[PDB]
Design a protein around this ligand. Structure first.
Ligand SMILES: [Mn+2]
Ligand SMILES: [Mn+2]
Length: 326
């Protein structure tokens, strides 16, 4: 009979979380009832959030922004080692793509949902293009959840992903979204805020752009090699920032050898938190510090740490909308 982590009277606690991270580090399984309790509870928390989360960072406060983690659970642990566990005084934003590709997707997403419950005002989760059924059917997550639990557990994951916020704006000055900006000029923050987000993202339009677009160095917009949305130039970014009174945007969605990249003259930052991506890329990863007194990004790089012998995509021309390879 089950000897693993249990909720303390239907409630997530710091000892539950520490127990949980140990239990996963040793490759064991959270009991499906507990998985179930966490899912329905984060669904209630996330459903009450705005599509655009607006947060104020006081002068002396900082926040940490992470990018793609893609089921690399042991690197997630290393982030919390390097940068401290989440708390009221150590807030976090995870900019999407917590799942798919890596073979510890379930470990990652339950760990991130448990902290969302423990510290709902300091631990933030934004939807990526991989928190959708489309990508999960292809890139391993649906498979992982079916091997470890049931198809019914998976449908509950899908429901919860539909409540993830799409963007976060800090101090009216920094906009964070997973993918990037838009295929038409003139989108406003109020437009974002009014997106009805609890759905699968469509083919085209603002919700799709926010999850799928990429920056390009030359001016203009180009048809995307991903099959939806577009590539946007420096001119697209400048006009967006100026209409919305913002300093710059932070985004994720693209592997980088240095763990990050600063494009469009400073205006468009990529942060990527999955080191040696897919056990293939050999890249560094990074996370960003932002200070309330000083919203310029501080980049902290880091390298991959060991994990169990479980190859990536282990649970995974005519499929459409592609992440780039892996
Ligand atoms: Mn992505
Ligand atoms: Mn990704």
């Amino acid at each position: 009979e089950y000897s693993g982590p249990k909720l303390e009277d239907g409630k997530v606690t710091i000892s539950f979380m520490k127990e949980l991270m140990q239990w996963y580090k040793d490759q064991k399984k959270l009991h499906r009832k507990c998985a179930y309790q966490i899912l329905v509870q984060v669904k209630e928390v996330l459903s009450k959030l705005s599509t655009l989360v607006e947060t104020t960072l006081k002068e002396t406060e900082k926040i940490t922004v992470c990018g793609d983690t893609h089921g690399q659970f042991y690197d997630l642990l290393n982030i919390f080692e390097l940068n401290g566990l989440p708390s009221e005084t150590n807030p976090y934003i995870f900019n999407g793509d917590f799942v798919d590709r890596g073979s510890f997707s379930v470990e990652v997403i339950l760990t991130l949902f448990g902290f969302k419950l423990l510290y709902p005002d300091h631990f933030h989760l934004l939807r990526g293009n991989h928190e959708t059924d489309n990508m999960n059917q292809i890139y391993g997550f649906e498979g992982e959840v079916k091997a470890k639990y049931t198809a019914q557990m998976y449908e509950l994951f899908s429901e919860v992903f539909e409540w993830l916020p799409l963007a976060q704006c800090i101090n009216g000055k920094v906009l964070i979204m997973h993918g990037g900006l838009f295929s038409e000029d003139g989108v406003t923050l109020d437009d974002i805020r009014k997106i009805e987000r609890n759905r699968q993202p469509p083919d085209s339009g603002p919700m799709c752009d926010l999850l799928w677009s990429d920056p390009q160095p030359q001016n203009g917009r180009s048809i995307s090699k991903r099959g939806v949305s577009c590539q946007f130039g420096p001119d697209v970014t400048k006009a967006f920032l100026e209409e919305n009174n913002l300093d710059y945007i932070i985004r994720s969605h693209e592997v980088k050898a240095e763990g990050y990249e600063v494009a469009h003259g400073g205006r468009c930052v990529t942060v990527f938190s999955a080191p040696n991506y897919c056990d293939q890329m050999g890249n560094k990863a990074s996370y960003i510090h932002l200070q309330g007194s000083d919203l310029r990004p501080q980049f902290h790089q880091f390298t991959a740490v060991p994990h169990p012998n479980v190859k990536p995509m282990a649970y995974a021309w005519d499929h459409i909308e592609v992440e780039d390879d892996e």
